[model samples]
Target: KFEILGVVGEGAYGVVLKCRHKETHEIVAIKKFKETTLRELKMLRTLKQENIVELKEAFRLYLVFEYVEKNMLELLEEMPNGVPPEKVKSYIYQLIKAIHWCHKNDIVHRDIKPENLLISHNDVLKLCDFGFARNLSEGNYDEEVATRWYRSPELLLGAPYGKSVDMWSVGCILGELSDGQPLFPGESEIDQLFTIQKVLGPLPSEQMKLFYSNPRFHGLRFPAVNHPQSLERRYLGILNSVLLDLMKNLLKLDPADRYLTEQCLNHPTFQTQRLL
Candidate 1:
């Protein structure tokens, strides 16, 4: 059905190849995973959102998707001065739309980092890579799921979490888009939490007790850091009040306090941008 042209990407689990349809000569990307897993295939098969990558076909260990030239990480690297708020709003709007569809279907993309967001030549961003996605109905997922920088505080604190964790990642991505750098580039899990604390401040005392009770966090001592919330200060002069407000809501330390995908879509930031 297709002829392999060359390699496009490679990771621990798989390699993606640029290919052409033998019959119509259409381009496509084929990701061949080392192991067969139905999680990603199931999620992709169920989700039919415009901003999510479309799965063209599935074989024993391979999945095919529409080919795109760049991912958000590469795009950020190219933009040293950071992506403008206008482009950031468009990309984020599409991202929230895709994530909203996933959440509505009871799916939680445990991983939502920049490398997983593909961009076409026309600049349409599509969410990709469901290797770590899960059904929300499943309880108590693995805490060590998302990449460190984008991982939510709940996950880092070893607490049971939900779709709100994905929203936390979206917040991290939003900050990276505006600053052209990761919001929390921690070297390790502990360091990651500290980085988050630096920006959002320490978790509430009740939450801290919950963290200490978790087996994974037993004996771990997080130093008292009296850093006030500095998200506005960090992005000041770059992002406007509306955009900053959205980021604040999305990056809330408490999962329940964070903005839901629908709420984020309805935020004033996008509202004003849409009217412009």
Candidate 2:
């Protein structure tokens, strides 16, 4: 039997409770879902990466996991100014490792954001919340998968997307970690694309054709703007060339142009960290 200590977190579909095993006095997190499915459990069981959250057991509406101290968002909130560059590198490196593991297993973690990244007392990041995850074969996933701020341009524009979307979210998370603020805090779907355009400039004609083909984007015309790649400028003081290049590659409008998980792990920015 377990004794519920308190609510650890809550979401649209579930509530996570911090609990203690009555017999062993061991602390754990029990996530109780209003409605349940086996996908998350299956994925958790399949994954054995150090940076991914560990699942203890699952029964009925509840799934138990190793207790974590705080999420990345909470940690970011504590640092109003910004997280240190070294810390940012460490966190993102771990995240890339975890993401690489998932991609290798043919899983796409559709929801990748700071709030979904839990941190241990020792500062180890554990990627959590797989409710939105899907198998890569499940073609054309819902457009409303990731959080608005972290959503990719392909997803927002209803393009046929894949694991590259997760890389885009990683770029957004990297940006937020550097500045302690969301990179694109758009209130609506259309607004999100515009926010991205301000930094990435307008989509290439081929990509725009795909975007405009979607009925949702039909009849919409965006005035031409000469917005250069300004991410380096925005993160001037915090990011060096290697880091900036990684961010630019991850946030590319074309999925083909974006670095794959393995490529990201092998990138020069993470070479030192990767050896450690």
Candidate 3:
């Protein structure tokens, strides 16, 4: 058993406390749910993945996990000065590996964002907070899974979705890692779509051509190719040709066109065999 050290995170579910094992002195995180919903409970029981936070133990009111020293969002905030390319590369690799694991098991992390990714002393990254995790099947994901800023363009368009949705979020995370900030950050849903259009050169015609097979593709109000390089000022030195090409494919604004997790993992930038 472990004694509570202090609090780490808080959300609608309850508080996540920092605790220490009484004998081994190992630190752990315990999330106490004031009123666990069926959704949260289902996720706890079925959505298992290394990228998903490991559950060491569970109780009626609390679920315990290993505590990570830092979160991806926190690391990015501290690095407002900027993170080196090598470090960014490492972070992306860890994140993609986790997502790849989840996809392999048919689990969709509905919520994939910096806030949900934790970083430990060894630069290990793990996805936390599965409250929104769900198994993807033959239909659309709930519109409320991921945060608005990290939400996929298909989700914004109210289209039925699947694993591809998570890839969109991966794109957003990649953009954030490279820019050291949020990419499609919008105050409102419309603003979010506007921001996406501004950066990615409007929704491309190929998008409709690509996902036309999907039942949700027709009659969608696709934003036309519009802004370009206007928002590059925020990305500054980080927007090299390599990074730009990666983001272009990742954040394609078309679910059918976004790069898959396996492709992302095998990307030259993330290949572990190569020395950066």
Candidate 4:
């Protein structure tokens, strides 16, 4: 059966164990799911995409995965300053490709952050942790799932949304890949929202109107502003032109105006296939 190698990680669901397949001697990640994690199982059954980590086997609530040695966050941590430009382009290319695949299928990975993205020893990055993934249903998006920094403005402002939210996350990821650091590492949810406003400017009236329309935005008022600031000064000269352009557009505070995954893939920064 299985021999436990050591602990990998733990979440609200359950602990992830590094294990070995006794027969093939292949390393595997055994995700022991708690009863509360059953919802993730249901989501996994319906949602499928290439960039996501493949589920190997599930029995009695235990999920198995092909163990990847490194995750994007961990790898970035090892690099200190940041990844090189050429390498950053390669990783981001694969990440965008995966995100594009999910959006095409109407899937929104609510929790899109560095922690959930795994990088193999060979540098192949795979999106893992489908604990919060869901199909795009009619009506709107949910704010309960995504991480605050990577969370879309629509979700932060409490709006019903769609696949575009995931694109928002992809944009955040691109920024991280370029700088090797979190673009908006806010201390709290409120801080994250304010940080977004500071960078992208005030949310447009149309986006604000839609935010008010959402049932969740009933009593909450948009944060007032005494001053407006730009992120340009903070991340100055650290990013190349291509990376800067992608980050600036994707990190837009208006969800309606955020770059779609297809557009992002077609962007000159990532459109490498044309070279052939």
Q: Provide TM-scores for the models.
A: 0.91, 0.92, 0.80, 0.83
Off by more than 4 A, model 4: 35-50, 137-146, 206-234, 273-276
All models: lDDT?
Answer: 0.83, 0.83, 0.70, 0.71
Look at candidate 3 and give me any clashing residue pairs. Answer: none
lDDT of 4 by residue, 204-223 (tens): 78767866677665687666
Give candidate 2 regions above 4 Å deviation.
138-146, 218-224
Global fold similarity of model 1 (TM-score): 0.91
Candidate 4 global lDDT? 0.71
Q: After the best TM-score superposition of candidate 3, give how far the Cα of residue 31 lies from its true spot, in angstroms.
A: 1.7
Question: Which window of 10 residues has the lowest lDDT sum in candidate 2?
Answer: 137-146
RMSD of 2: 2.1
Off by over 4 Å in 3: 35-51, 138-146, 204-226, 230-236, 272-276
Candidate 1 lDDT score relative to the true structure? 0.83
Residue 134 of model 3: what lDDT? Answer: 64
lDDT of 3 by residue, 1-276 (tens): 778789897876568889998999989888876553445656656656555677777776677787888888888899874467777767776777777877876767777888888887777778877766666752332323337788876676566556787877877787778767788887765567677777766655554454454555465554454546543454667756565565666776667777877777667665552343
Candidate 2 Cα deviation (angstroms), residue 49: 1.3
